Amino acid sequence: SVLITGVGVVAPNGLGLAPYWSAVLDGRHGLGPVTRFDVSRYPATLAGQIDDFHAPDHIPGRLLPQTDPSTRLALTAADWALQDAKADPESLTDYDMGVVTANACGGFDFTHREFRKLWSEGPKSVSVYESFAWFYAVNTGQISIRHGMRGPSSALVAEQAGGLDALGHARRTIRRGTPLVVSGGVDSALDPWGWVSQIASGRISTATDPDRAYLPFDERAAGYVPGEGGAILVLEDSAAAEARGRHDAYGELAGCASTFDPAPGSGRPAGLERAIRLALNDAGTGPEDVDVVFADGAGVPELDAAEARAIGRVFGREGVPVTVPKTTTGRLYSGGGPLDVVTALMSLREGVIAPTAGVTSVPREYGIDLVLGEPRSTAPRTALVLARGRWGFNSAAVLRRF
Amino acid sequence: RRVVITGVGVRAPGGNGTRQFWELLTSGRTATRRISFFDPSPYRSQVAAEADFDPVAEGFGPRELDRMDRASQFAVACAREAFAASGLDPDTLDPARVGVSLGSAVAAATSLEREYLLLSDSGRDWEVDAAWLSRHMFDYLVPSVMPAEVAWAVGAEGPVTMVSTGCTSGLDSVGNAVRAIEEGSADVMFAGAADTPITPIVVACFDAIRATTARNDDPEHASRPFDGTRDGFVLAEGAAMFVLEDYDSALARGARIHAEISGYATRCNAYHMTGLKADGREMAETIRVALDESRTDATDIDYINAHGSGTRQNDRHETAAYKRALGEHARRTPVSSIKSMVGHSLGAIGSLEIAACVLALEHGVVPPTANLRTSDPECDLDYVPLEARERKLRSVLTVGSGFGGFQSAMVLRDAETAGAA
Ligand SMILES: [Mg+2]
Ligand code: NA
Numbered sequence: 001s002v003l004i005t006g007v008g009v010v011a012p013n014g015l016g017l018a019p020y021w022s023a024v025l026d027g028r029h030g031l032g033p034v035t036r037f038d039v040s041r042y043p044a045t046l047a048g049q050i051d052d053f054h055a056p057d058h059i060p061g062r063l064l065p066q067t068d069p070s071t072r073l074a075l076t077a078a079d080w081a082l083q084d085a086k087a088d089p090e091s092l093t094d095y096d097m098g099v100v101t102a103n104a105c106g107g108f109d110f111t112h113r114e115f116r117k118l119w120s121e122g123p124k125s126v127s128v129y130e131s132f133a134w135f136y137a138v139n140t141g142q143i144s145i146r147h148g149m150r151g152p153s154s155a156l157v158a159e160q161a162g163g164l165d166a167l168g169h170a171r172r173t174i175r176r177g178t179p180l181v182v183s184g185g186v187d188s189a190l191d192p193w194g195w196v197s198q199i200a201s202g203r204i205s206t207a208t209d210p211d212r213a214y215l216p217f218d219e220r221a222a223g224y225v226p227g228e229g230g231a232i233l234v235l236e237d238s239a240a241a242e243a244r245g246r247h248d249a250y251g252e253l254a255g256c257a258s259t260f261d262p263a264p265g266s267g268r269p270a271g272l273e274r275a276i277r278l279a280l281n282d283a284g285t286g287p288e289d290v291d292v293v294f295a296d297g298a299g300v301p302e303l304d305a306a307e308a309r310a311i312g313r314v315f316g317r318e319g320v321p322v323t324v325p326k327t328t329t330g331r332l333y334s335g336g337g338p339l340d341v342v343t344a345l346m347s348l349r350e351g352v353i354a355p356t357a358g359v360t361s362v363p364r365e366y367g368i369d370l371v372l373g374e375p376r377s378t379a380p381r382t383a384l385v386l387a388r389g390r391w392g393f394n395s396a397a398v399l400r401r402f
Numbered sequence: 403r404r405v406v407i408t409g410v411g412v413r414a415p416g417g418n419g420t421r422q423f424w425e426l427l428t429s430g431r432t433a434t435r436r437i438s439f440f441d442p443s444p445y446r447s448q449v450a451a452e453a454d455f456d457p458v459a460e461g462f463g464p465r466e467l468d469r470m471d472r473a474s475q476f477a478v479a480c481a482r483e484a485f486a487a488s489g490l491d492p493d494t495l496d497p498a499r500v501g502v503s504l505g506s507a508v509a510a511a512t513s514l515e516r517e518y519l520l521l522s523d524s525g526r527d528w529e530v531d532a533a534w535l536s537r538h539m540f541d542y543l544v545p546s547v548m549p550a551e552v553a554w555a556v557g558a559e560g561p562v563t564m565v566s567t568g569c570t571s572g573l574d575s576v577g578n579a580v581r582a583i584e585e586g587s588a589d590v591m592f593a594g595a596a597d598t599p600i601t602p603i604v605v606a607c608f609d610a611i612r613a614t615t616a617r618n619d620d621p622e623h624a625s626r627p628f629d630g631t632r633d634g635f636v637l638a639e640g641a642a643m644f645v646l647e648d649y650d651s652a653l654a655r656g657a658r659i660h661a662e663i664s665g666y667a668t669r670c671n672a673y674h675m676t677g678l679k680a681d682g683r684e685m686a687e688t689i690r691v692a693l694d695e696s697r698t699d700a701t702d703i704d705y706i707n708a709h710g711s712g713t714r715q716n717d718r719h720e721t722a723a724y725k726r727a728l729g730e731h732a733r734r735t736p737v738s739s740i741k742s743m744v745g746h747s748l749g750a751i752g753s754l755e756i757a758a759c760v761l762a763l764e765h766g767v768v769p770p771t772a773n774l775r776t777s778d779p780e781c782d783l784d785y786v787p788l789e790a791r792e793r794k795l796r797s798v799l800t801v802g803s804g805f806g807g808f809q810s811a812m813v814l815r816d817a818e819t820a821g822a823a
Contacts, residue, residue, distance in 0.1 A: 119525030136566035141806025200539035260562035
């Protein structure tokens with residue numbers, strides 16, 4: 001049995017769990033114009049920025065020179081998660097602590113500046129940190145070093161599906177013999193190149209009204225709004241947890257599953273439905289048992305329809321409450337799955353389903369029971385979390401009330 | 403559940419395919435030469451191990467070539483070769499039970515640099531011009547496309563992912579696939595790694611920390627792991643892919659069992675993002691754990707495919723780890739670094755090393771550590787210098803170290819030894 005004992009959230013609508021959970025239940029989003037640079041010259045201009053995070057106030061002066069914005073957020077998140085769980089890395093066996101994160105863009109702001117210096121000034125101007133500030137494994141290695149965690153660790157890349165996959169990867173590791181595992185993800189690509197790169201997805205909203213730009217499952221859906229941030233959580237063996245003196249947790253990670261859609265043009269069906277049923281089996285729970293589904297919420301019509309269809313096939317149309325709180329944060333890529341998990345656990349703990357912001361009219365076609373406006377007090381005990389990654393990555397995770 | 407390798411695919415510098423690859427390693431010659439992909443004059447390390455690759459000849463169409471980064475071209479080419487050698491019948495395969503685990507350290511570094519010049523007007527503008535935006539830019543920003551590309555080539559619909567743990571990716575990707583099959587999440591896995599980092603930004607970042615050799619006057623002997631005059635690794639590109647499956651199933655279908663991955667483990671330094679301690683504590687434990695899973699005694703190891711990057715700290719580092727884990731056996735077991743001949747392809751190297759061990763297990767020849775002429779007191783083990791060595795291999799060990807503190811080790815044994823397990 002793997003439990004979630006500590007969480008750490010860094011989101012566009014809240015630096016820290018409390019502020020975040022407060023904004024979510026109140027429908028407050030952290031969306032708005034990009035101010036990291038002049039976006040007026042690009043098609044897309046809205047993003048989920050974290051504007052109340054001053055690295056120097058959270059990260060040691062030593063790490064500032066060598067860390068990308070994404071890594072600083074991950075380290076802050078990681079630290080908060082470890083103390084939320086009342087876990088002291090210095091008081092635990094080094095090999096009994098692992099680190100599994102997902103990373104989609106890596107330290108892109110950092111690498112962009114290094115690319116510019118190289119061609120603007122020359123190779124000699126390149127930072128001595130470029131060698132490790134950008135690569136995808138960066139956040140696992142930095143979290144590892146900062147807390148003296150030496151157990152089995154990894155870094156995965158699977159766009160927005162990665163974050164959930166990382167969590168599932170941690171579950172595997174814990175079950176094989178590592179008592180505690182820090183897991184999650186955080187992404188940030190709010191520099192001109194990272195921005196233009198995201199626009200190349202062909203799926204980014206070009207809206208200018210922050211309240212109506214990211215509308216998953218709404219008939220006016222016109223693309224997703226990018227965001228920066230995510231979450232890191234502490235997972236650990238049930239027994240080891242209680243033995244540690246930690247008898248309080250957020251919930252249990254009951255089951256996990258990853259599938260991949262068939263190649264483009266095959267016409268064959270997507271693998272989202274399969275992932276869901278695989279995750280439910282792993283958890284030993286049936287469709288009827290699920291009380292709430294935290295949907296991937298693509299915000300792209302064709303993708304919303306695909307997702308609504310998979311959910312309907314498993315739980316029946318309007319067969320289960322569906323919600324998409326990420327409407328308040330934007331898509332955080334490797335941070336999205338982890339944050340969705342945190343939001344779900346909180347719903348289970350607080351007995352209320354976090355609502356979906358913005359969406360006002362859901363097409364009958366989707367056949368879903370979306371939670372809009374206010375939180376729905378149904379006191380859910382089991383939640384299903386879904387995430388998809390560009391090119392066909394599917395990921396499902398089932399959680400249970402502690 | 404036990405996992406074995408039924409097919410191999412490789413694309414290394416001077417080694418297009420297992421035959422040529424093995425021919426190169428046993429011959430002891432090197433493939434490290436002066437960089438030709440671009441003008442190295444401005445940089446410190448001007449040598450690299452470049453693979454001779456012809457996309458058109460590999461069978462890629464116009465869209466695929468315009469679409470995929472060089473590293474994905476290598477990966478897919480290798481996956482296809484491994485699929486072919488496996489003999490696994492495509493028709494009898496259930497896509498929902500076939501997964502992918504691709505490793506890569508720097509992924510699309512090459513396409514990023516290419517696109518960066520068009521967007522920024524060669525470094526002039528921070529606020530890049532969307533007028534020159536590639537229609538594939540997002541896929542270089544987020545490398546996930548690499549595993550997808552392979553999955554589409556092999557018809558994979560099970561767990562598909564990218565493992566990116568720096569210079570241990572080549573091992574961790576295969577290890578991940580092993581765990582997938584063992585846990586029952588898949589029956590067939592296409593695992594391996596690829597990296598095509600020979601690009602200005604990567605060379606410049608290694609020069610900054612002087613991790614790569616500055617010996618540009620003699621490219622052919624630039625990579626010299628464990629050697630007393632070593633001054634850094636040699637940057638390289640490359641890829642390797644394997645077909646992994648259930649042990650009983652492979653036996654049942656009458657497949658060729660190239661080797662059984664009887665053990666795998668990884669641990670971290672928690673010390674420094676690029677630095678290493680002389681003790682080799684963490685790596686020792688990793689080797690211990692891998693051996694423990696494998697159930698094989700240290701004395702069973704017939705060969706050790708080292709990391710052997712060629713940097714001062716590394717070579718000395720693992721030497722300590724071996725003596726710490728294998729004790730006396732460390733001194734009476736052959737050890738060698740193929741990086742001395744194919745260079746350090748970062749995330750790809752671990753897979754090439756696995757392929758090398760599989761080939762050794764079959765042909766019974768231990769590849770030498772080329773350029774090893776001056777001995778180093780800190781590296782006082784047997785690194786099979788210059789010439790290959792005839793030897794019966796049944797159980798082999800391979801390890802790797804990467805930025806971030808990652809330390810990984812894998813145990814590979816032949817079919818004969820597996821059947822006796
Ligand atoms: Mg090795
Ligand atoms: Na904000």
